[PDB]
Design a protein around this ligand. Structure first.
Ligand SMILES: Nc1ncnc2[nH]cnc12
Ligand SMILES: Nc1ncnc2[nH]cnc12
Lengths: 392, 386
């Protein structure tokens, strides 16, 4: 009984130039280009096993984190599977001797090792990489990113390692809305990142959200004029390894994104009081250093990502650890240490009384990473009958 | 013959926000703004001015019982100089008048704001100084003309020279002659307009706003949008259309805080309690089936919630349901049916997260007061000293 199965992981990525707004909601074509750093799969990843077998019971089945997920026709997962099956069928049409993998049911199981960390970009990228390997697709990562983009917009940027653009494109059919390497991981491997996972228990109760910004935010129209300039500038900065300009652009575009969220009617809020305190600390770190050594950025929630070159991570750790005692124990994967605040650091930028333990829940030290990884049989999430090994 | 005048001036709250100066010396703004003047029965700044030929040379001023320096070329000094010059014009035309302009000034001011409210006081404070000196000197100048002096001395002070609904017109004259306040509608036009100030627990405007001017790209689009909001909100006020007034007020408040966020470094005034109040007001409007309340936020986390007098019980009820207030600081209605309490953290907020509530309403312009209201003793020193 021959087994046709592939397992792949894909990385998380954190946008420096933010995706926020679609011009086509079905194809997921964006209102502007975006640009991200791919993070190290040694620390954060999604992993997906896909198997096709002529003897599986009819109908595809998919599990996420051990719970079966319905694959409704037309939805994000179904569309991705349909496009990748079509590319496999094309191979079979050209070479009639190939086994007819495209005709068989799929069994798919995925897990991430993650807090409020956005899991859809790495998750859909892992699905695409896994199925592309299962089907031995000839398509390039760029071509595969067209499919990932339709599962979840920022998933397309997780098809590459290093520093990665999503080019907005101008084709109404989306053929040029895809990811592109701006610089590979080996160009600037010292780019590290500290993720600050923030408690968010004082609020009430993104795809629906960002379209409300498109519909109602007057300030968004100026953001769309500014983003191309930041794309060009941050690409130059990465190519030049100019950390200060990379950092300035990253902080400016993060704040720009949260600004147009605030300008939405009704307003959209993601930063919380802890997020703002982390910004104050990073801003004061750069000021006291007399040099921009760290850059915060925030996606659609209060967690901070702080970019810094490895050599300056002890300053970032020192500042965060000084003001934000964590409930989770912290070990750097590299045993990176902690340095005292630069002389002149104004501790008054943090509230009187400080922050209670757990206001920041925990820290994750990671760095710029490679693209998706095809794994070995040993890593499979599926048992011998095609049902996941772990069911929640 | 004692020459002494006491006047009060109101606080005002901008619906269309002033944020950004095109001229920092004359205080000319990057855009027009528009506010509601609040009732001096509730919040007021009060200033007594006296001129006397036998005072010791040099003007003196006290604020809340503490003496304040009036250095030449400073804001207060230039304000006094301009008003003195208008008085000297009177004495030139009428040689019989006493030479009040030639005599030293003793000035005392006080505001009645609640302890720890976080309310900005410089605007009503300078408006009261201007009204008091104009009364002392018997100046003929109109409120509009006086607002030029208030504007130069303290910006949005110019909008407190009028009651009701007041515009600060940005003007185009580089010397500022047309950057002044103008009445959009008097208090009597819409006296039903009430306001609930929510004093929020909070763990620099002048320098701050110029950083936004220097660094915010989104500000440049805000400056294109504000004239549209000014026209629309003036029409809504004239039509007494609360829902349109409310939408514009909430939109421009959020626009202001957005360009603060887009400043480099970013400026943050709203906090998590501010955000919760916004969630409650928006859900109140939804559950009520019509817009009955409008939040707005200035340079800090305090909320001001506009509402017609008849709907204040709903607004007060919703705020007191989720934000129990402090001891250190009225009929209420239950939440409308269908209000989703999920828009607030479970169980609401701790007591004192909102410290207290001030219920006020649209009010008239500055008031000239009586001898009994004087802040000065017989010798021209304040009655109450710190
Ligand atoms: N790991 C994953 N695989 C597929 N879809 C996902 N959506 C979120 N995470 C996912
Ligand atoms: N009442 C007042 N008088 C003068 N200047 C002030 N600044 C703030 N409040 C004031």
């Amino acid at each position: 009984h021959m087994v046709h199965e592939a397992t792949a992981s894909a990385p998380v990525n954190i946008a420096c130039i933010k995706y926020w707004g679609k011009r086509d909601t079905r194809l997921i074509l964006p209102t502007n280009s975006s640009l991200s750093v791919t993070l190290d799969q040694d620390h954060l990843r999604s992993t997906t096993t896909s198997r096709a077998d002529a003897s599986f019971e009819a109908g595809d089945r998919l599990w996420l984190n051990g719970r079966e997920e319905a694959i409704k026709e037309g939805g994000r997962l179904a569309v991705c599977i349909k496009e990748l099956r079509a590319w496999r069928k094309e191979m079979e049409t050209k070479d009639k001797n190939l086994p007819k993998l495209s005709e068989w049911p799929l069994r798919i199981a995925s897990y991430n090792n993650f807090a409020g960390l956005a899991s859809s970009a790495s998750g859909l990228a892992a699905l695409v990489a896994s199925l592309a390997s299962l089907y031995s697709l000839p398509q390039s990562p760029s071509q595969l990113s067209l499919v990932a983009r339709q599962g979840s917009g920022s998933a397309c940027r997780s098809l590459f390692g290093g520093f990665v653009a999503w080019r907005e494109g101008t084709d109404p059919a989306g053929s040029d809305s895809l990811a592109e390497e701006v610089a590979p991981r080996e160009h600037w491997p010292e780019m590290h990142a500290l993720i600050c996972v923030v408690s968010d228990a004082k609020k009430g109760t993104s795809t629906s959200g960002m379209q409300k910004t498109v519909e109602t935010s007057t300030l968004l129209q100026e953001r769309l004029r500014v983003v191309p300039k930041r794309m060009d500038a941050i690409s130059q900065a990465i190519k030049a390894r100019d950390f200060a300009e990379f950092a300035k652009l990253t902080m400016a575009d993060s704040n720009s994104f949260h600004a147009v969220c605030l300008d939405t009617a009704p307003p959209i809020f993601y930063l919380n009081d802890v997020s703002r305190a982390i910004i104050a600390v990073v801003e004061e770190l750069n000021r006291a250093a007399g040099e921009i050594i760290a850059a915060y950025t925030f996606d659609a929630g209060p967690n901070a990502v702080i970019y810094t070159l490895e050599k300056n991570m002890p300053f970032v750790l020192g500042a965060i650890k000084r003001f934000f005692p964590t409930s989770e124990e912290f070990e750097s994967p590299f045993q990176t240490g902690v340095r005292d605040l630069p002389e002149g650091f104004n501790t008054g930028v943090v509230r009187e009384g400080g922050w209670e333990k757990g206001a920041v829940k925990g820290l994750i030290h990671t760095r710029v990473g490679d693209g998706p990884r095809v794994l070995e049989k040993e890593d499979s999430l599926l048992g011998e009958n095609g049902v996941p090994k772990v069911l929640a």
